[PDB]
Design a protein around this ligand. Structure first.
Ligand SMILES: [Zn+2]
Lengths: 48, 653, 278, 102
């Protein structure tokens, strides 16, 4: 292919590098989603 | 598009590489600008290729929406004189193309093969073939229906059972709960008897012939019953049957609008005429809908707005919204604002750009209902796309806004737009499930209910498990309907939670200590699972690719029926027939039996080889379409490869 | 026969004399009258509320003077809008604002006069700013016990108002009564200036006016230092060591974030040197 | 085919990229709403109050307190300080109607 299946992997590498980068940013969001739901449940605790 | 022409013209094969790429490109393409430009040059090289392929013209028919191009392709098929090969695009143009495109193609084509095209676009023969499918595959169970009947609750029971049996009784036209108890239906009053003549049109949906003379007992003009709300549902009853395609009943509605009941006739009358003219872009219906908008009455305001978005759907009428949103400021009622909220929302669909001009006005305004209008408007406009510009303001109104009802309708728009990729909804709506206010959780549960209804995803069932455990009563009810949409047509062999939820629906309703509110959606969750006798499903994503208008309009009106009870009886819009057909051609019914690898456990409605019709047709699950193989020993064998459902051609050897 | 759940449209002008005339009777209970227009069965509006003489001997049905209303309606004719009377209201500051024994005796009298005669109660005590409080009710006829006793259609506007269910004795009056939904028809014209008049008067009076130096920081350093050791002994208390003491315990708050904002107060107030001057 | 998915995979990439401002804008609002909820609990009960005598701490989130009139009252404690100022026997202020421990 030479355009190509060797280059497209490097193209797919960029996405997977950003996907892992996004997963790192997502991992930064995922544990931060807990800090919300926690305080969101604590926002229900003051209402409890 | 230059080098693309060389890539599609490359030698050898590439047998299907042009076929599935259009399915892949449609999903990954952000800008539709040059998308169809790639498609229009692709369908040309299909015809230039030696082997004709009719699945390519199916895709460009809806996307290019050119009435002059669709007229010339069949005009050649008329000269080609073979009705077998054109029989695929005959019903494909029917089930796929909307009412606006059907009215344009029917005119240029009809100007044998001329009589054959009449019933395909009007759906005449298409109703009866699936009318005979229902009565066969339908398996009635009266046990659970009686288990919810003996609660003996004076209210909320009259609305619950008549809408629950209409689920499993879809299209069978039979009369059962009317004949068995006369006195119990007489106990109903106010808007409850509105459903008796309404749910009568549900079970009778389809069957375009007898729908006139059978309901003559409920005629508002001649009978004039003591309760005025009983005679107001006769107009809305036939609108169900007459959704999309119309008929002679257009005069039947004209006779009952000018006599007897006023203005509650305009309630069921405009919804009956508006749903019948839905997609047709009719004029005279818009004329009498403006004076119904100015009647100033709050209850009739819903009928004026809801019927106006129907008829003008896809047309994008300028004067419609101008008279609607122009009346929204000085009106004193919320219900006129509601029907108008969906009214301006129903007219704008799938544009992705033009509708954004109104979206800026809706959400920015301080009217609580008009902010709900922006969410139903941005949903239908963005329906079928994952655009990141809509989710921006979607969360901002779902959080920063003080009103809880608009936060609900805000998260409900995620199920309308994202149904193409339902896997994304459980992730984005996850964090919204911990909201302290149950109003958001009611819509959060619905977002997984409406979007994932067709899918068999078990994760949505897992997320809906704590939803019915929440102390709030209506979030439990919202969890019952949503968890009933995920299991449609799916039995215990699919997911183990089936029998767990089925016993819970009858449990809570037979328990008097539980709230009457939540237990209304209990038996209704049964019926949702039993809808059409488990025969028919509801799918917004199909090979056709178009959204399903009556189910969305019906379920969005059924979101909150606590403002007006007819909105609970307007759930009758969610009832639609669907099936597959093995008919070869014309009126001749072939005898064909082919094997299936799935057990009767899926066929049970509370292996080596199976037996399927042989057109009445036989049932199939969307998951069972891949495991079935066309019979090699039959005299009648299909010329087209059989993969997904729908009516396909069958060639005689 | 046909009964639909009613929606009450209250005007921001009618909301005034509800709490204001109720405040004048505090602690004792007052007796008012609601003024509005009946549009239809399922909706109702109260466009005005006026004050009635408070009863120091206790509320009675004779506390309302008929010549007080006859002289008032005549003064409403020369006033912009002469709208017909609708119903009554009464304050109950001393308790959770529930219908008393006199309130039911004045029901059948007022519901004979006017069709609905919505019973409206209000209390000052339950909150100050961010709660609707107040109350409302409508008598469901006890003679209807022979007929269906569970109105209304279009339920949850009641059902949701049936939340929280407000303890026992309140909903103990749900026998022979049913409450009514209160929503606000938009006054936002007035409501926009209601926010502007409130916040501008609360923003430094000109925004200018408001815009113990080292000593306030010498008093703050006692909170920024002498409080540190009682705060920073707790991590040495988190060291057990190790481990016989019940854990976890989090002493991080609230002093840490207070001293943070304490600098935020002192830094931007010291910026007044750089901000105001030049 | 590999460029196909290569044009597919950046969707959920960018779909989660807009999901970054999704939560971050949502959580800060709710944070300010939670800070607004801090003013709520501090608003209650404001004034007036009544003196009462603490008896013993029976369990978490609630404790019994004798009223000045002598009648012992079992009251949910305030969620702020559950421990250090509790003490076995002390005079604690209570609200008029609710007799809330503050
Ligand atoms: Zn009183």
């Amino acid at each position: 292919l030479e355009e190509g299946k060797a280059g497209s992997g490097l193209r797919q590498y960029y996405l997977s590098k950003i996907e892992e980068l996004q997963l790192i940013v997502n991992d930064k969001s995922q544990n931060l989603r807990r800090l919300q739901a926690q305080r969101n449940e604590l926002n229900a605790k003051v209402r409890l | 598009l230059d080098v693309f022409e060389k890539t599609i013209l490359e030698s050898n094969d590439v047998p299907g590489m042009l076929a599935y790429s259009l399915k892949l490109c449609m999903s990954l393409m952000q800008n539709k600008q040059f998308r169809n430009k790639v498609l229009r040059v692709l369908v040309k090289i299909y015809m230039n290729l030696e082997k004709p392929d009719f699945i390519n013209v199916c895709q460009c028919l809806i996307f290019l929406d050119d009435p002059q191009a669709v007229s010339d392709i069949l005009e050649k098929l008329v000269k080609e004189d073979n009705l077998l090969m054109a029989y695929q695009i005959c019903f494909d143009l029917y089930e796929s193309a909307s009412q606006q495109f059907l009215s344009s193609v029917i005119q240029n084509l009809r100007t044998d093969q001329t009589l054959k095209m009449i019933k395909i676009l009007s759906g005449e023969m298409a109703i009866e073939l699936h009318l005979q499918f229902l009565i066969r595959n339908n398996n009635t169970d009266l046990m659970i229906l009686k288990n919810t009947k003996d609660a003996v609750r004076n209210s909320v029971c009259h609305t619950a059972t008549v809408i629950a049996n209409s689920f499993m009784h879809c299209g069978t036209t039979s009369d059962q709960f009317l004949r068995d108890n006369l006195e119990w239906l007489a106990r109903a009053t106010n808007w409850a008897k509105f459903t008796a003549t309404a749910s009568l049109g549900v079970i009778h949906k389809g069957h375009e012939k007898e729908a006139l003379q059978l309901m003559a007992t409920y005629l508002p003009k001649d009978t004039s019953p003591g309760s005025a709300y009983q005679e107001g549902g006769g107009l809305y009853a036939l609108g169900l049957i007459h959704a999309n395609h119309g008929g002679d009943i257009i005069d039947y509605l004209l006779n009952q609008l000018k006599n007897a009941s006023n203005d509650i006739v305009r309630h069921g009358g405009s919804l009956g005429l508006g749903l019948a003219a839905m997609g047709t872009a009719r004029q005279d219906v818009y004329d009498l809908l403006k004076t119904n908008l100015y009647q100033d009455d709050a209850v009739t305001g819903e009928a004026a707005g809801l019927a106006l978005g129907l008829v003008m759907l896809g047309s994008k009428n300028a004067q419609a919204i101008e008279d609607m949103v122009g009346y929204a400021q000085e009106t004193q009622h919320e219900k006129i604002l509601r029907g108008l909220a969906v009214g301006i929302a129903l007219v704008m669909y799938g544009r992705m750009e033009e509708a954004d001009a109104l979206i800026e006005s809706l959400c920015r305004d301080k009217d609580p209902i008009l902010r709900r209008s922006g969410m139903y408007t941005v949903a239908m406009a963005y329906c079928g796309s994952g655009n990141n510009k809509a989710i921006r303001r979607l969360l901002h109104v779902a959080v920063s806004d003080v009103n809880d009802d608009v936060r609900r309708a805000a998260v409900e728009s995620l199920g309308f737009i994202l149904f193409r990729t339902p896997e994304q909804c459980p992730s984005v709506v996850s964090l919204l499930s911990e909201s302290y206010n149950p109003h958001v959780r009611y819509g959060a549960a619905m977002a997984l209910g409406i979007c994932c209804a067709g899918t068999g995803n078990k994760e949505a069932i897992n997320l809906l498990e704590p939803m019915t455990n929440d102390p709030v009563n209506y979030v439990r009810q919202g969890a019952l309907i949503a968890s009933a949409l995920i299991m449609i047509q799916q039995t215990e062999i699919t997911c183990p939670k089936v029998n767990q939820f089925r016993q819970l629906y009858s449990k809570v309703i037979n328990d008097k200590h539980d709230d009457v509110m939540a237990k209304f959606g209990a038996i209704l969750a049964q019926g949702i699972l039993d809808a059409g006798g488990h025969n028919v499903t509801i799918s917004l994503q199909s090979r056709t690719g178009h959204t399903h208008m009556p189910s969305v309009v019906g379920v969005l009106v059924f979101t909150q029926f606590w403002f007006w009870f007819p909105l609970s009886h307007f759930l009758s819009l969610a009832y639609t027939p669907t099936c597959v057909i093995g008919l070869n051609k014309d009126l001749k019914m072939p005898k064909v039996q082919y094997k299936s690898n799935c057990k009767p456990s899926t066929f049970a409605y509370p292996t080596a080889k199976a037996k399927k019709k042989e057109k009445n047709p036989a049932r199939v699950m969307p998951a069972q379409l891949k495991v079935l193989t066309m019979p090699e020993t039959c005299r009648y064998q299909p010329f087209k490869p059989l993969s997904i459902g729908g009516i396909i051609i069958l060639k005689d050897t | 026969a046909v009964d639909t759940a009613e929606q009450v449209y209250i005007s921001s002008l009618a909301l005034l004399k509800m709490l204001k005339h109720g405040r004048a009777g505090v602690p004792m209970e007052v007796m008012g009258l609601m003024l509005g227009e009946f549009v239809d069965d399922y909706t109702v509006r109260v466009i005005d509320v006026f004050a009635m003489p408070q009863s120091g001997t206790g509320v009675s049905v004779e506390a309302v003077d008929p010549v007080f209303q006859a002289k008032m309606l005549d003064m409403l004719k020369q006033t912009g809008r002469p709208e017909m009377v609708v119903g009554w209201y009464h304050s109950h500051p001393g308790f959770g604002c529930w219908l008393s024994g006199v309130d039911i005796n004045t029901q059948q009298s007022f519901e004979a006069l006017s069709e609905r005669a919505v019973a409206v109660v209000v209390d000052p005590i339950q909150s100050v700013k961010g709660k609707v409080v107040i109350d409302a009710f409508r008598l469901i006829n006890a003679n209807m016990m022979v007929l269906g006793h569970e109105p209304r259609q279009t339920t949850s506007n009641l059902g949701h108002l049936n939340k929280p269910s407000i303890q026992a004795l309140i909903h103990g009056l749900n026998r022979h009564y049913y409450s009514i939904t209160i929503n606000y028809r938009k006054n936002e014209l007035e409501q926009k200036m209601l926010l502007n008049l409130h916040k501008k008067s609360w923003m430094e009076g000109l925004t200018l006016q408001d815009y113990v130096v080292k000593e306030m920081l010498e008093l703050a350093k006692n909170y920024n230092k002498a409080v540190e050791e009682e705060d920073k002994m707790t991590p040495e208390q988190l060291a057990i060591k190790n481990v016989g003491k019940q854990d976890p315990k989090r002493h991080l708050e609230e002093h840490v974030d207070v001293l943070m904002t304490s600098n935020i107060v002192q830094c931007l107030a010291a910026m007044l040197d750089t901000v105001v001057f030049k | 085919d590999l460029y196909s998915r290569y044009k597919k995979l950046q969707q959920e990439l960018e779909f989660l990229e807009v999901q970054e401002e999704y939560i971050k804008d949502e959580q800060k609002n709710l944070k300010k709403e939670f800070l607004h909820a801090q003013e709520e609990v501090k608003r209650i009960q404001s004034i007036p109050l009544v003196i009462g005598q603490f008896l013993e701490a029976v369990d978490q989130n609630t404790a019994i307190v004798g009223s000045t009139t002598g009648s012992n009252y079992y009251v949910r404690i305030l969620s702020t300080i559950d421990r250090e100022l509790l003490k076995p026997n002390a005079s604690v202020a209570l609200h008029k109607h609710s007799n809330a421990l503050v």
